[PDB]
Amino acid sequence: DYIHIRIQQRNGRKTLTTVQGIADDYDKKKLVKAFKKKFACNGTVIEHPEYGEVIQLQGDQRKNICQFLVEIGLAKDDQLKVHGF
RNA sequence: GAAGACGGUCGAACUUGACUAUCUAGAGGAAGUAAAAGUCGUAACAAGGUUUCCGUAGGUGAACCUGCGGAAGGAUCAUUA
């Protein structure tokens, strides 16, 4: 069950790095309030629907979420599935 | 009238602690600095779209936010009842 990410850049720079696999059971405040306060980027939590509850961090955060995912306790080091936007 | 010699005084030096001053090694740790063309936010240059800033306290990814009392170096030297 790979925690998909997706990024989504609007402007030449207006980015949002989601987080798709974090079961809701997790601290709706940890996952992401551990992220923002980390590499330092605007996280959040939407119910995207082609996916089903994903975490928008703000940024092209695809080298970072390899890492903010070898890190805090949600999924696992093989689950890794990056298809940067 | 010598060596020696009784006991003393000065007391170098030596051994061990204390004291004071000056200098200097150090795993690592945490500041500040440069600084600067990087990353994430917009905190307070045009009222910067939340006027700004001071003292102070708590709190926040991060710039910062907020209360309480100040200041204009403000966006009012005026208010015409």
Side-chain angles (χ1 to χ4, degrees):
Chain A
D1 229 15
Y2 274 165
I3 317 264
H4 254 66
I5 281 305
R6 218 62 112 219
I7 292 202
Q8 42 197 82
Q9 203 174 56
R10 251 133 135 169
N11 232 39
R13 90 156 204 127
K14 191 83 57 47
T15 342
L16 281 162
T17 291
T18 28
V19 191
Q20 329 169 8
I22 293 332
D24 212 49
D25 212 23
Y26 316 166
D27 320 10
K28 189 184 293 165
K29 337 215 144 89
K30 224 98 205 107
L31 197 169
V32 91
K33 200 201 221 273
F35 171 89
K36 267 161 146 151
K37 204 159 215 205
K38 198 164 164 350
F39 326 91
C41 327
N42 238 300
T44 153
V45 53
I46 74 175
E47 193 217 4
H48 213 257
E50 245 219 74
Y51 316 145
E53 201 257 334
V54 302
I55 288 270
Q56 253 181 199
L57 323 141
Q58 272 259 2
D60 57 270
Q61 233 82 238
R62 97 187 53 67
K63 262 312 290 170
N64 262 280
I65 212 105
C66 311
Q67 206 68 314
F68 195 74
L69 280 54
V70 181
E71 308 185 80
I72 95 171
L74 263 64
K76 289 285 73 189
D77 290 333
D78 200 292
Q79 289 183 47
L80 288 170
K81 221 2 90 173
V82 65
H83 322 266
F85 69 124

Short mmCIF file of all heavy atoms in Angstrom, two decimals, chain A residues 15-17 32-44 56-61 64, chain B residues 39-41 61-62:
data_model
loop_
_atom_site.label_atom_id
_atom_site.label_comp_id
_atom_site.label_asym_id
_atom_site.label_seq_id
_atom_site.Cartn_x
_atom_site.Cartn_y
_atom_site.Cartn_z
N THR A 15 3.47 25.74 -5.89
CA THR A 15 3.44 24.27 -5.73
C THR A 15 2.67 23.77 -4.48
O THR A 15 2.46 24.52 -3.52
CB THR A 15 4.90 23.68 -5.72
OG1 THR A 15 5.82 24.62 -6.28
CG2 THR A 15 4.99 22.43 -6.51
N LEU A 16 2.23 22.51 -4.50
CA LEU A 16 1.58 21.88 -3.34
C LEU A 16 1.90 20.38 -3.29
O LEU A 16 1.41 19.59 -4.10
CB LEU A 16 0.05 22.15 -3.29
CG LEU A 16 -0.57 23.48 -2.78
CD1 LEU A 16 -2.01 23.65 -3.24
CD2 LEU A 16 -0.51 23.63 -1.26
N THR A 17 2.76 19.97 -2.36
CA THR A 17 3.10 18.56 -2.20
C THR A 17 2.17 17.82 -1.25
O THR A 17 2.19 18.02 -0.03
CB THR A 17 4.53 18.34 -1.76
OG1 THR A 17 5.40 18.70 -2.84
CG2 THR A 17 4.76 16.87 -1.43
N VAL A 32 1.67 15.79 9.17
CA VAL A 32 2.00 17.05 8.52
C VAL A 32 2.62 18.13 9.45
O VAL A 32 3.52 18.84 9.01
CB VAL A 32 0.81 17.57 7.57
CG1 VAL A 32 -0.17 18.49 8.30
CG2 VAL A 32 1.33 18.24 6.31
N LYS A 33 2.21 18.24 10.72
CA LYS A 33 2.84 19.25 11.60
C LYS A 33 4.23 18.78 11.97
O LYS A 33 4.97 19.47 12.69
CB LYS A 33 2.04 19.61 12.87
CG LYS A 33 2.42 21.00 13.53
CD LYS A 33 2.04 21.15 15.03
CE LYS A 33 1.46 22.53 15.41
NZ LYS A 33 2.52 23.51 15.77
N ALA A 34 4.58 17.59 11.48
CA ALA A 34 5.97 17.19 11.51
C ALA A 34 6.66 17.55 10.21
O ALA A 34 7.88 17.60 10.15
CB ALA A 34 6.14 15.73 11.79
N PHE A 35 5.89 17.75 9.16
CA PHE A 35 6.50 18.02 7.87
C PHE A 35 6.88 19.47 7.75
O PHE A 35 8.01 19.81 7.43
CB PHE A 35 5.49 17.73 6.78
CG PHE A 35 5.95 18.19 5.44
CD1 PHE A 35 6.68 17.34 4.64
CD2 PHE A 35 5.67 19.48 4.98
CE1 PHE A 35 7.14 17.75 3.38
CE2 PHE A 35 6.13 19.91 3.73
CZ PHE A 35 6.87 19.04 2.92
N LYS A 36 5.86 20.32 7.93
CA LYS A 36 5.94 21.76 7.71
C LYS A 36 7.19 22.18 8.49
O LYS A 36 8.18 22.60 7.93
CB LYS A 36 4.66 22.48 8.21
CG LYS A 36 3.53 22.68 7.13
CD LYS A 36 2.12 22.95 7.68
CE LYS A 36 1.28 23.92 6.82
NZ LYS A 36 -0.22 23.77 6.83
N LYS A 37 7.16 21.91 9.79
CA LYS A 37 8.26 22.24 10.69
C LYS A 37 9.49 21.41 10.39
O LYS A 37 10.26 21.08 11.28
CB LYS A 37 7.82 22.14 12.18
CG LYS A 37 8.72 23.03 13.16
CD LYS A 37 8.13 23.38 14.45
CE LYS A 37 8.61 24.85 14.83
NZ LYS A 37 8.67 25.26 16.19
N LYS A 38 9.72 21.16 9.11
CA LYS A 38 10.89 20.39 8.78
C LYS A 38 11.78 20.76 7.62
O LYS A 38 12.98 20.64 7.73
CB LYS A 38 10.53 18.93 8.66
CG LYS A 38 11.68 18.18 8.75
CD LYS A 38 11.38 16.78 9.01
CE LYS A 38 12.62 16.08 8.70
NZ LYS A 38 13.63 16.98 8.01
N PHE A 39 11.23 21.08 6.47
CA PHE A 39 12.08 21.26 5.35
C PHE A 39 11.49 22.44 4.86
O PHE A 39 11.79 22.92 3.84
CB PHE A 39 11.70 20.27 4.34
CG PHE A 39 11.28 19.05 4.90
CD1 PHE A 39 9.95 18.78 5.22
CD2 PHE A 39 12.26 18.18 5.20
CE1 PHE A 39 9.68 17.62 5.78
CE2 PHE A 39 11.98 17.09 5.68
CZ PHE A 39 10.72 16.79 5.98
N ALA A 40 10.43 22.68 5.59
CA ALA A 40 9.93 23.96 5.77
C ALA A 40 9.17 24.45 4.58
O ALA A 40 9.83 24.93 3.70
CB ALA A 40 11.07 24.76 6.05
N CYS A 41 7.90 24.02 4.53
CA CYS A 41 7.00 24.00 3.38
C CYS A 41 5.50 23.80 3.78
O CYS A 41 5.19 23.04 4.66
CB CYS A 41 7.49 23.01 2.30
SG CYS A 41 9.22 22.71 1.98
N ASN A 42 4.57 24.51 3.14
CA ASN A 42 3.17 24.52 3.62
C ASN A 42 2.42 23.22 3.38
O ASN A 42 1.81 23.07 2.37
CB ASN A 42 2.33 25.70 3.06
CG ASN A 42 1.71 26.60 4.16
OD1 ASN A 42 0.91 26.15 4.99
ND2 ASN A 42 1.96 27.90 4.06
N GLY A 43 2.43 22.32 4.36
CA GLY A 43 1.65 21.10 4.34
C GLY A 43 0.18 21.34 4.58
O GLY A 43 -0.22 22.45 4.93
N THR A 44 -0.64 20.31 4.32
CA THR A 44 -2.06 20.27 4.72
C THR A 44 -2.72 18.91 4.39
O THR A 44 -2.04 17.99 3.94
CB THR A 44 -2.91 21.40 4.11
OG1 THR A 44 -4.26 20.95 4.01
CG2 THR A 44 -2.40 21.81 2.71
N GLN A 56 -1.34 17.57 1.04
CA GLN A 56 -0.72 18.62 0.25
C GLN A 56 0.31 19.31 1.12
O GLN A 56 -0.03 20.01 2.06
CB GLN A 56 -1.76 19.66 -0.23
CG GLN A 56 -2.10 19.58 -1.73
CD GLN A 56 -3.13 20.61 -2.25
OE1 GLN A 56 -3.73 20.44 -3.32
NE2 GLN A 56 -3.31 21.69 -1.51
N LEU A 57 1.58 19.07 0.85
CA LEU A 57 2.60 19.90 1.43
C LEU A 57 2.79 20.85 0.33
O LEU A 57 2.48 20.52 -0.80
CB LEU A 57 3.84 19.09 1.58
CG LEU A 57 3.27 17.75 1.95
CD1 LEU A 57 4.04 16.69 1.29
CD2 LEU A 57 3.27 17.65 3.42
N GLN A 58 3.27 22.04 0.63
CA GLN A 58 3.57 22.95 -0.46
C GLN A 58 5.01 22.75 -0.97
O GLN A 58 5.97 22.98 -0.23
CB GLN A 58 3.30 24.43 -0.12
CG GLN A 58 1.85 24.92 -0.39
CD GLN A 58 1.65 25.71 -1.65
OE1 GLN A 58 2.58 25.91 -2.44
NE2 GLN A 58 0.40 26.22 -1.84
N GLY A 59 5.14 22.27 -2.21
CA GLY A 59 6.43 22.15 -2.90
C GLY A 59 6.66 20.96 -3.83
O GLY A 59 5.93 19.98 -3.80
N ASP A 60 7.70 21.07 -4.67
CA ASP A 60 8.14 19.97 -5.56
C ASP A 60 8.80 18.88 -4.73
O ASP A 60 9.89 18.39 -5.03
CB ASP A 60 9.11 20.49 -6.63
CG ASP A 60 10.34 21.19 -6.04
OD1 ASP A 60 10.29 22.42 -5.83
OD2 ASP A 60 11.36 20.51 -5.79
N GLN A 61 8.10 18.51 -3.68
CA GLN A 61 8.71 17.91 -2.53
C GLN A 61 8.88 16.40 -2.82
O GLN A 61 8.33 15.56 -2.10
CB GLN A 61 7.86 18.24 -1.27
CG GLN A 61 8.60 18.87 -0.05
CD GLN A 61 8.84 20.40 -0.12
OE1 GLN A 61 9.98 20.87 -0.05
NE2 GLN A 61 7.77 21.18 -0.17
N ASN A 64 12.54 15.30 -0.97
CA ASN A 64 12.16 15.51 0.45
C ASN A 64 11.22 14.44 1.06
O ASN A 64 11.45 13.98 2.19
CB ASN A 64 11.46 16.89 0.63
CG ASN A 64 12.40 18.01 1.13
OD1 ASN A 64 12.70 18.11 2.33
ND2 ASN A 64 12.78 18.90 0.21
P U B 39 15.32 28.72 -4.51
OP1 U B 39 14.51 28.20 -5.63
OP2 U B 39 14.91 30.03 -3.97
"O5'" U B 39 15.36 27.68 -3.33
"C5'" U B 39 15.14 26.29 -3.49
"C4'" U B 39 14.50 25.70 -2.27
"O4'" U B 39 15.37 25.87 -1.13
"C3'" U B 39 13.19 26.38 -1.78
"O3'" U B 39 12.11 25.86 -2.58
"C2'" U B 39 13.19 25.94 -0.35
"O2'" U B 39 12.88 24.62 -0.24
"C1'" U B 39 14.58 26.10 0.11
N1 U B 39 14.90 27.38 0.75
C2 U B 39 14.79 27.44 2.12
O2 U B 39 14.44 26.49 2.80
N3 U B 39 15.10 28.66 2.67
C4 U B 39 15.49 29.78 1.99
O4 U B 39 15.72 30.81 2.63
C5 U B 39 15.59 29.64 0.58
C6 U B 39 15.30 28.46 0.02
P C B 40 10.61 26.27 -2.42
OP1 C B 40 9.78 25.50 -3.37
OP2 C B 40 10.55 27.78 -2.50
"O5'" C B 40 10.27 25.83 -0.95
"C5'" C B 40 8.94 25.50 -0.52
"C4'" C B 40 8.76 25.88 0.98
"O4'" C B 40 10.03 26.02 1.67
"C3'" C B 40 8.09 27.21 1.32
"O3'" C B 40 6.68 27.12 1.12
"C2'" C B 40 8.48 27.37 2.73
"O2'" C B 40 7.79 26.48 3.58
"C1'" C B 40 9.89 27.12 2.74
N1 C B 40 10.70 28.31 2.42
C2 C B 40 10.94 29.19 3.42
O2 C B 40 10.53 28.89 4.57
N3 C B 40 11.62 30.34 3.16
C4 C B 40 12.06 30.58 1.92
N4 C B 40 12.74 31.73 1.72
C5 C B 40 11.83 29.67 0.85
C6 C B 40 11.16 28.54 1.14
P G B 41 5.96 27.93 -0.03
OP1 G B 41 4.70 27.23 -0.42
OP2 G B 41 6.93 28.17 -1.11
"O5'" G B 41 5.59 29.31 0.64
"C5'" G B 41 4.40 29.50 1.41
"C4'" G B 41 4.68 29.77 2.92
"O4'" G B 41 6.00 29.40 3.39
"C3'" G B 41 4.48 31.19 3.35
"O3'" G B 41 3.09 31.40 3.50
"C2'" G B 41 5.27 31.27 4.62
"O2'" G B 41 4.57 30.72 5.71
"C1'" G B 41 6.54 30.41 4.38
N9 G B 41 7.61 31.20 3.78
C8 G B 41 8.06 31.10 2.49
N7 G B 41 8.99 31.97 2.21
C5 G B 41 9.17 32.67 3.39
C6 G B 41 10.03 33.75 3.69
O6 G B 41 10.85 34.32 2.96
N1 G B 41 9.86 34.19 5.01
C2 G B 41 8.98 33.67 5.90
N2 G B 41 8.95 34.25 7.09
N3 G B 41 8.19 32.65 5.64
C4 G B 41 8.34 32.21 4.38
P G B 61 5.33 24.65 15.40
OP1 G B 61 4.66 23.44 14.84
OP2 G B 61 5.93 24.50 16.76
"O5'" G B 61 6.42 25.13 14.39
"C5'" G B 61 6.00 25.45 13.05
"C4'" G B 61 7.19 25.21 12.17
"O4'" G B 61 6.80 24.74 10.86
"C3'" G B 61 8.05 26.44 11.83
"O3'" G B 61 8.93 26.77 12.92
"C2'" G B 61 8.82 25.90 10.67
"O2'" G B 61 9.85 24.99 11.05
"C1'" G B 61 7.78 25.24 9.89
N9 G B 61 7.13 25.97 8.81
C8 G B 61 5.84 26.42 8.81
N7 G B 61 5.53 27.09 7.73
C5 G B 61 6.69 27.06 6.97
C6 G B 61 6.98 27.63 5.71
O6 G B 61 6.23 28.30 4.97
N1 G B 61 8.29 27.39 5.32
C2 G B 61 9.20 26.70 6.05
N2 G B 61 10.41 26.61 5.53
N3 G B 61 8.95 26.14 7.22
C4 G B 61 7.68 26.36 7.61
P A B 62 8.74 28.20 13.63
OP1 A B 62 9.38 28.18 14.96
OP2 A B 62 7.33 28.63 13.58
"O5'" A B 62 9.59 29.21 12.75
"C5'" A B 62 10.99 29.01 12.50
"C4'" A B 62 11.25 29.46 11.09
"O4'" A B 62 10.58 28.67 10.07
"C3'" A B 62 10.69 30.89 10.77
"O3'" A B 62 11.44 31.92 11.34
"C2'" A B 62 10.77 30.86 9.25
"O2'" A B 62 12.10 30.89 8.82
"C1'" A B 62 10.16 29.48 8.94
N9 A B 62 8.72 29.65 8.89
C8 A B 62 7.79 29.34 9.85
N7 A B 62 6.56 29.62 9.50
C5 A B 62 6.68 30.15 8.23
C6 A B 62 5.74 30.64 7.30
N6 A B 62 4.42 30.65 7.52
N1 A B 62 6.20 31.10 6.12
C2 A B 62 7.52 31.07 5.89
N3 A B 62 8.51 30.63 6.67
C4 A B 62 8.01 30.18 7.84
#
